[PDB]
Amino acid sequence: HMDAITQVPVPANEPVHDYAPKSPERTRLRTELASLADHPIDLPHVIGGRHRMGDGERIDVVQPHRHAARLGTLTNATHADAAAAVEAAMSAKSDWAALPFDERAAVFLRAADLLAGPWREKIAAATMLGQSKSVYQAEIDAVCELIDFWRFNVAFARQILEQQPISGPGEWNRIDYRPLDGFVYAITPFNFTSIAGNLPTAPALMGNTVIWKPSITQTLAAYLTMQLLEAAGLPPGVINLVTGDGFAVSDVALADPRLAGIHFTGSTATFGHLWQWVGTNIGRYHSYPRLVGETGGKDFVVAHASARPDVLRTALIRGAFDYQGQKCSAVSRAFIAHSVWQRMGDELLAKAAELRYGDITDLSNYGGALIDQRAFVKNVDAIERAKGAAVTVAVGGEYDDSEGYFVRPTVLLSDDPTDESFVIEYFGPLLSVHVYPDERYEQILDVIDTGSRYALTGAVIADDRQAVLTALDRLRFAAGNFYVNDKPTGAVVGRQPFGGARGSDTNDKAGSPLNLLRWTSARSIKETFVAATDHIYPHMAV
Amino acid sequence: HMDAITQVPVPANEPVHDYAPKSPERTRLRTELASLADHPIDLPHVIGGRHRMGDGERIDVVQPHRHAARLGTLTNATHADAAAAVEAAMSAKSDWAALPFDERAAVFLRAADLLAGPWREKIAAATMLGQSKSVYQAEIDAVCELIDFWRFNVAFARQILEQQPISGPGEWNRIDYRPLDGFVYAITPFNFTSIAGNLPTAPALMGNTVIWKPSITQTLAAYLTMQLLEAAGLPPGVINLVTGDGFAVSDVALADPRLAGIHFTGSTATFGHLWQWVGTNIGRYHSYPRLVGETGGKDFVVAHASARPDVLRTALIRGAFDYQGQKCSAVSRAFIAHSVWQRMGDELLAKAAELRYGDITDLSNYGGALIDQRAFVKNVDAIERAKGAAAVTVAVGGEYDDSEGYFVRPTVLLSDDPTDESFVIEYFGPLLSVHVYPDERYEQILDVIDTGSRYALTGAVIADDRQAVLTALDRLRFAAGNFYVNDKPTGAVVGRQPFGGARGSDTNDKAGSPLNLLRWTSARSIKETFVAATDHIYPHMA
Amino acid sequence: HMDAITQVPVPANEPVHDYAPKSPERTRLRTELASLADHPIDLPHVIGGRHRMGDGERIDVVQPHRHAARLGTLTNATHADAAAAVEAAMSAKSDWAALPFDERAAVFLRAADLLAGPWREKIAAATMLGQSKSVYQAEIDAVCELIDFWRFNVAFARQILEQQPISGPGEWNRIDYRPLDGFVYAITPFNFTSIAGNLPTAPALMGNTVIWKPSITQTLAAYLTMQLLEAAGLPPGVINLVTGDGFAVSDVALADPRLAGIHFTGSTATFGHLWQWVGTNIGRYHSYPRLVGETGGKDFVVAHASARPDVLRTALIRGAFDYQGQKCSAVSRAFIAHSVWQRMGDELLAKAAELRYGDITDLSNYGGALIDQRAFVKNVDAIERAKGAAAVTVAVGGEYDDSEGYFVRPTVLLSDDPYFGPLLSVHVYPDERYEQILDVIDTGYALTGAVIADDRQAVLTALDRLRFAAGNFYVNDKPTAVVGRQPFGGARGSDTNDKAGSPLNLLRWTSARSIKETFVAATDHIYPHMAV
Ligand code: B12
Ligand code: B12
């Protein structure tokens, strides 16, 4: 037993290492990079703690920047693999939920520290190699964001458990934050190792068990993440990894009456599909399935006449070309005041032309390649469509998939304000610029407001305080998270929570205590010390 | 302007008046009861501030305990009325949302004080008359719970606004809790004037506008609630009352692309139907519609051998027979240890037979009648079902008479085997089933309760023995939402028993906590960077 | 537009850079020192965002440690310039006060960060060159203290807004912290770039507009401060810089009915002048003008027999000779126990003689020159007065030479019996007369005082006996103040707890109102006591 009201360790954001030349983290990275690239492995399912290949189709995981070089080979999950995954989760449930919160929280605090230290460059390298991230992109994702999710989630949960009601006289009221009944189905995207690791672990923390199907092109980092958690003491069957395209996993998971929730990322259409499925089939499930996730998007930047040219240029290059434009959202559209374009337009184009995409084991590259052949084709189609469209290819537009899925940084010049519908059909290094007359700032904000339904983030570049405030007012609803004098980009944990595209309902996604509450079912407990012994009410008296 | 970080008044639960003989509030109540009953009124739509009867069929609102006596007449809303209400809500949106939080809050704080003072016995009487509540039931509902919702939600909202993120060095992060785009559709049940009043006002507080369709039999109190809110300063069009059965209202609201959310009560099947509809048609809406509500249920009480018999008796009588069993849930099943039944069985049956249901203007009555003809018929069916059933005996009560009011007597069913839950949910009325179990089979009975209950909102254990209490807390942890120790299991007091819900439900975002107000917001982060990067190159590239 | 209750960032004191050899801030500093010295500029007024030279007489701004070298040239404000600055302030007021606190706050937060990074060495260099500060004196003033002023004032302001009343039942009470009606007049001294920058920006933060009149010798750093603020996003006309001696500026500003307050730091001589001038015109002002400021003073150090000699010796050197004794207060009198003087007197004199005053672009120098010819003269007069006095011996230093800079050597005087400059008077007293020496100090004005003693009774005796003899008291350190750490003070009898360094200052730039809403007020006027 134990008699205490304990605290969890206070979290702070994990520092970002630079990997400068001659740094010790740089040397350790090269060691891990070589270790992973020279020794490809089976990428097995992990079900009830046991690691095995299944009988499904073998699919190679390759380096996107060098797709002749294989990192590993997984087996596409069969229905039977999926069924085993679900039985393993259900079977582990009782012992996992019976652990005190602190013991469950220690698993992820230990995992965070393992990732911060001895596992650091290995998870980063795995992410670099499988997902074609530069070391910086891997460091902010696979290391810092995942570590932050774990430590801040533990703190979030402890804060939740402490939210308690008022006790009136003669009584005692308490709230018990129960885990869910049944298993959680986590489906994770290629874009981030952090999301990949967090969607399955966040409900686990609250006492739930999980089947996890990661994206194929992220599976090397996913599998190592699974190993890391095991090394941290995660009991077998608490999270169950099944690899592949997810088709057979979804057949099984959505047919199981014990399905408690789905933690995922996807489009509005995907949400709608799952909504329609769960609603149509609600009578099949023991619990009402909880559908929790986020969408992707494409972002905008608007520069006022008072914009600092160099800050804008840099915000644009990073916002559009960090990770080859393959974050959950990237900057696709820039709205630049004429006088500002006169001052930094040529520089933007020149820097874009010089920007290096290549093998990310060459640390001098800015970035790598697109994630797979499918993503490559969509970028080529968008580029060709731009060439023929009455818009100019000011720089870039070159592509070559002979060795890696490489697409050059591309700037399009649109005479008229760029139509949003066109930029959402691909994810890649494609920036559209519209130059507008300085004096039409308010008109352009209205065009941005009127024509943006798919932005996660937006930014205004301006030193003028009125212009900043006007943008904050006028574009209040045109994007979720909004930025002043910086690139609009991914959130740091605990610093830019919430957001979402216009009209969305995703404030319960990862990044705040609201996400963890979805994986709980609160009940109130009331005890009355001296309750009534006569049912008569005062008003009934003669 | 204004330069301040303001606090809202600190909320405390509103005191409950007793209306004992010779009390001033009892005299005021009698004045109000006569005024409403002797002067039936039109019950019009309130659209954009204009009170109008429409062209739909006229429907009488009556006293359920004396259905020959009209209280008013409403008109069934047409599609045109519903369209006008939506347009009024969208017209009022801009000025309302632009009001500072404090001024929007003031409206509902003022309404709280109006209901606590000058409007108190009028709203109570309206609820008494229309919903057939005793004054005690009116008081805890129409007065105290509605007041507590307003004052506590204002405090909840202010607490939400204060939830802010970390600022790293060189930056400033802030969170903006935006209203939704579009209107909220509020659909409210007959059972509580408080719920009827809270579901449309809670979103309004956060800067939204609303169409409100109340239940026909609650429409006298709902219309007066609407008048109260106007007297407190609610601007026109912010809440728009449309009367009737809701069919045409739902046609229009669910077809309008500006539908932002629905705030309602209903069954799992209703939730499923709305999920199915919104998912199938997601492409029609500007925003992802938010479906926020709660369900009803039927509750249980288990008495251990160490239960205090007078306490158990009182909790069963009040739990099953308060408001004729017509709360959101009520006690339908009691599981009582043999030796405790020997001590209080005869007294339970005798008290139940003596319990007076009648005209609630006669304050000496315990309670009134069922809410309408349809509910009466369902009770009759349940009683005849029991009479013909081999398993069960009518031990007391079972009489019914709809000739003057919709009256059904307090009824106790004795069941040889544990009562099958599926029977007790087909009605809402004063029907208590009792199962007597051998003292020594306490844990077995707990397993039976657990295995056979899917629809309990609340549950209670009566027991002085601490092991027995703790065993119930553990073993029935998931068999009900809110759980009670040595008291009747019933409706929560605001801020004292939040959350709950039936097994597997997902309704922790319902009214009663800050989580509900967050659903009527769309939070965004704002990040200003003071000295952003001016070169895009990264340290690892050197 | 926002629905939120926001927090401002948490302020921490800015780290002081050491500028040691081979350090990168040293290289960056040398670049800025050359760039400012080799390319003197016009120093214009800044009125409604417009940078304009005026028609008043041209006045050069030079390096005090090399007064032949011009740093820039300003024009002395004319009545017309002053009137233009006032109109620009009043015209800018409406859009500035209408900005939300957070947006006004961002300007100074952004300025703070700009000063910490890209502007750091330039502003420090301008302060070194114009005011003759060593790089250390520049860094703790022009950089760290100004940065701290901005970040902590933002935190202080936000904590003021949060100070709210209690609501009884049936009501809602709130407090609105309004800005002032009218413009605030900031007049700032040569001593500190940080003070020069804080006096106009602090009222600005609370939503006021300002005319700012800096000291001629500080005007290079002040103008760059103005540019930095503009680069941070300060809207035009919110602060208006008028250069010169300020005679014309005061003529206009103190006659204008819209004068809301004066924010000043410098001599009590020139504050008497300006205190008085309001005293007469009082019926003319729309608002009761708020006079807020601080004056100078000179400090004592008393060393008990238990004083550590190395500590005392170091406290005296730095306290007396940091910035050539020209801080808002300097150590000018020391009272040293005989046994202690035997142990460190010779070393004090020796060190004082070796202390290098010179061109502060020579980073090996301890300090530079006095601020101007007027200051040079008053020290010479003081030195020559000491020579000619009986009870006074010039034990070391006393030399001076204004031929190239305004240089006065570190000087220690010895008096048998008990102006800004590097002059220290030492009185040696017998150990066993500690309490009598305390009485003497008490009876003999002083801003800060310090006791050097390891003995706790001795320490506590001084804290008790000199409680009212100084406004800031120090134990085992030089009395030479840091934002948020040693606030308040003032000379004996002064009323200046509302000066810079605490929330009380920002409150002087606000007029608070209460707002009360009653939800269900009385509908009858008769009282219960009136019934029959
Ligand atoms: C809805 C859906 C789609 C949608 C997806 C988005 C939407 N809602 O508008 C659209 C409508 C895009 C779609 C397209 C197709 N899909 Co489909 N899709 C489904 C379904 C029913 C649900 C998937 C889902 O939402 N999962 C939940 C989310 C959270 O998980 P997810 O891993 O992120 O799911 C993504 C992928 O599954 C992907 N996807 C969907 N279908 C297909 C098909 C292929 C070949 C690939 C590579 C990817 C892919 O889209 C989802 C959203 O990103 C499944 C059934 C199933 N068993 O999976 C099929 C299913 C996967 N798709 C199938 C087929 C046949 C098709 C189509 C060829 C025909 C068609 N038009 O429906 C095309 C191929 C498109 C392509 N990408 O190459 C088959 C796959 C058969 C197989 N290869 O083994 C499935 C299994 C249904 C079936 N049994 O017939 N369909
Ligand atoms: C889903 C639904 C039902 C369900 C409800 C529960 C469920 N999901 O399993 C069941 C399946 C119970 C149902 C039954 C019937 N309903 Co129906 N119902 C609907 C529907 C499509 C949506 C209602 C809803 O969920 N509203 C949202 C909730 C949150 O709001 P609510 O006010 O609380 O809704 C409640 C009432 O509408 C009530 N209800 C539903 N139908 C009917 C019909 C009548 C006559 C009454 C009095 C009440 C009622 O059930 C809801 C939940 O309690 C509507 C269409 C519409 N425009 O409203 C019809 C609709 C109201 N019902 C209709 C009809 C014809 C019927 C039935 C007579 C025949 C049938 N089986 O379809 C029966 C009558 C039942 C009765 N109580 O008398 C017609 C009404 C025509 C008219 N008189 O003007 C509608 C307009 C359209 C339709 N048939 O599709 N239906």
mmCIF file of C-alpha atoms and ligand atoms in Angstrom, chain B residues 185 187 213 245-248 250-251 262 264-265 267 269-270 273-274 374, ligand 2:
data_model
loop_
_atom_site.group_PDB
_atom_site.id
_atom_site.type_symbol
_atom_site.label_atom_id
_atom_site.label_comp_id
_atom_site.label_asym_id
_atom_site.label_seq_id
_atom_site.Cartn_x
_atom_site.Cartn_y
_atom_site.Cartn_z
ATOM 1 C CA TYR B 185 -29.386 24.632 -32.059
ATOM 2 C CA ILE B 187 -33.252 21.208 -27.961
ATOM 3 C CA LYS B 213 -36.704 24.554 -29.143
ATOM 4 C CA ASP B 245 -42.669 19.442 -31.833
ATOM 5 C CA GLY B 246 -39.365 20.339 -33.448
ATOM 6 C CA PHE B 247 -39.824 18.510 -36.719
ATOM 7 C CA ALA B 248 -39.725 21.579 -38.977
ATOM 8 C CA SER B 250 -34.765 20.211 -37.269
ATOM 9 C CA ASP B 251 -35.491 20.192 -41.035
ATOM 10 C CA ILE B 262 -26.530 21.017 -31.323
ATOM 11 C CA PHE B 264 -29.593 18.498 -26.607
ATOM 12 C CA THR B 265 -30.627 15.550 -24.542
ATOM 13 C CA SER B 267 -30.804 8.406 -26.156
ATOM 14 C CA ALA B 269 -29.911 5.960 -30.637
ATOM 15 C CA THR B 270 -30.564 9.693 -31.058
ATOM 16 C CA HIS B 273 -28.781 9.201 -35.725
ATOM 17 C CA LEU B 274 -27.270 12.666 -35.437
ATOM 18 C CA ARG B 374 -48.190 9.201 -23.916
HETATM 19 C C1 B12 D 2 -34.939 9.377 -35.770
HETATM 20 C C2 B12 D 2 -36.429 9.620 -35.833
HETATM 21 C C3 B12 D 2 -37.333 8.588 -35.262
HETATM 22 C C4 B12 D 2 -36.978 7.581 -34.177
HETATM 23 C C5 B12 D 2 -36.455 8.254 -32.886
HETATM 24 C C6 B12 D 2 -35.375 7.545 -32.037
HETATM 25 C C7 B12 D 2 -34.307 6.793 -32.795
HETATM 26 N N1 B12 D 2 -33.339 7.502 -33.356
HETATM 27 O O1 B12 D 2 -34.340 5.578 -32.858
HETATM 28 C C8 B12 D 2 -38.122 6.492 -34.097
HETATM 29 C C9 B12 D 2 -37.086 5.646 -34.797
HETATM 30 C C10 B12 D 2 -38.329 6.432 -32.591
HETATM 31 C C11 B12 D 2 -39.075 7.332 -34.893
HETATM 32 C C12 B12 D 2 -40.339 6.988 -34.736
HETATM 33 C C13 B12 D 2 -41.472 7.617 -35.416
HETATM 34 N N2 B12 D 2 -41.459 8.858 -36.078
HETATM 35 CO CO1 B12 D 2 -39.764 9.690 -36.433
HETATM 36 N N3 B12 D 2 -38.328 10.921 -36.474
HETATM 37 C C14 B12 D 2 -36.935 10.690 -36.479
HETATM 38 C C15 B12 D 2 -36.225 11.892 -37.151
HETATM 39 C C16 B12 D 2 -35.595 11.428 -38.471
HETATM 40 C C17 B12 D 2 -35.159 12.627 -36.318
HETATM 41 C C18 B12 D 2 -35.643 13.000 -34.924
HETATM 42 C C19 B12 D 2 -34.480 13.454 -34.078
HETATM 43 O O2 B12 D 2 -33.611 12.671 -33.732
HETATM 44 N N4 B12 D 2 -34.443 14.738 -33.739
HETATM 45 C C20 B12 D 2 -33.331 15.236 -32.961
HETATM 46 C C21 B12 D 2 -33.654 15.183 -31.477
HETATM 47 C C22 B12 D 2 -32.423 15.516 -30.652
HETATM 48 O O3 B12 D 2 -34.683 16.123 -31.209
HETATM 49 P P1 B12 D 2 -35.978 15.682 -30.412
HETATM 50 O O4 B12 D 2 -36.994 16.779 -30.435
HETATM 51 O O5 B12 D 2 -35.645 15.279 -29.016
HETATM 52 O O6 B12 D 2 -36.469 14.417 -31.254
HETATM 53 C C23 B12 D 2 -37.325 13.445 -30.694
HETATM 54 C C24 B12 D 2 -38.675 13.454 -31.367
HETATM 55 O O7 B12 D 2 -38.574 13.855 -32.734
HETATM 56 C C25 B12 D 2 -39.137 12.015 -31.243
HETATM 57 N N5 B12 D 2 -39.900 11.602 -32.434
HETATM 58 C C26 B12 D 2 -39.361 11.060 -33.526
HETATM 59 N N6 B12 D 2 -40.319 10.797 -34.433
HETATM 60 C C27 B12 D 2 -41.508 11.166 -33.945
HETATM 61 C C28 B12 D 2 -42.799 11.126 -34.444
HETATM 62 C C29 B12 D 2 -43.840 11.612 -33.659
HETATM 63 C C30 B12 D 2 -45.263 11.586 -34.169
HETATM 64 C C31 B12 D 2 -43.555 12.154 -32.303
HETATM 65 C C32 B12 D 2 -44.693 12.667 -31.474
HETATM 66 C C33 B12 D 2 -42.256 12.182 -31.811
HETATM 67 C C34 B12 D 2 -41.222 11.705 -32.598
HETATM 68 O O8 B12 D 2 -37.966 11.223 -31.113
HETATM 69 C C35 B12 D 2 -36.813 12.035 -30.945
HETATM 70 C C36 B12 D 2 -36.000 11.469 -29.789
HETATM 71 O O9 B12 D 2 -36.804 11.431 -28.612
HETATM 72 C C37 B12 D 2 -37.372 12.879 -37.413
HETATM 73 C C38 B12 D 2 -37.244 13.844 -38.594
HETATM 74 C C39 B12 D 2 -37.475 15.246 -38.062
HETATM 75 N N7 B12 D 2 -37.624 16.233 -38.924
HETATM 76 O O10 B12 D 2 -37.538 15.465 -36.878
HETATM 77 C C40 B12 D 2 -38.597 12.015 -37.321
HETATM 78 C C41 B12 D 2 -40.045 12.259 -37.652
HETATM 79 C C42 B12 D 2 -40.305 13.318 -36.604
HETATM 80 N N8 B12 D 2 -40.807 11.120 -37.109
HETATM 81 C C43 B12 D 2 -41.826 10.836 -38.051
HETATM 82 C C44 B12 D 2 -42.649 9.631 -38.045
HETATM 83 C C45 B12 D 2 -43.690 9.561 -39.129
HETATM 84 C C46 B12 D 2 -42.457 8.686 -37.097
HETATM 85 C C47 B12 D 2 -43.281 7.413 -36.848
HETATM 86 C C48 B12 D 2 -44.787 7.711 -36.732
HETATM 87 C C49 B12 D 2 -43.122 6.281 -37.871
HETATM 88 C C50 B12 D 2 -41.737 5.690 -37.938
HETATM 89 N N9 B12 D 2 -41.496 4.589 -37.243
HETATM 90 O O11 B12 D 2 -40.906 6.215 -38.635
HETATM 91 C C51 B12 D 2 -42.810 6.990 -35.463
HETATM 92 C C52 B12 D 2 -43.656 7.592 -34.332
HETATM 93 C C53 B12 D 2 -43.001 7.498 -32.954
HETATM 94 C C54 B12 D 2 -43.720 8.222 -31.829
HETATM 95 N N10 B12 D 2 -42.981 8.495 -30.762
HETATM 96 O O12 B12 D 2 -44.896 8.530 -31.881
HETATM 97 C C55 B12 D 2 -42.066 11.993 -38.974
HETATM 98 C C56 B12 D 2 -43.177 12.906 -38.411
HETATM 99 C C57 B12 D 2 -44.305 13.297 -39.371
HETATM 100 C C58 B12 D 2 -45.320 14.204 -38.688
HETATM 101 N N11 B12 D 2 -46.200 13.663 -37.876
HETATM 102 O O13 B12 D 2 -45.341 15.395 -38.865
HETATM 103 C C59 B12 D 2 -40.679 12.643 -39.016
HETATM 104 C C60 B12 D 2 -40.847 14.160 -39.134
HETATM 105 C C61 B12 D 2 -39.935 12.240 -40.292
HETATM 106 C C62 B12 D 2 -39.727 10.779 -40.665
HETATM 107 N N12 B12 D 2 -40.685 9.875 -40.565
HETATM 108 O O14 B12 D 2 -38.647 10.479 -41.111
HETATM 109 N N13 B12 D 2 -38.604 8.291 -35.822
#
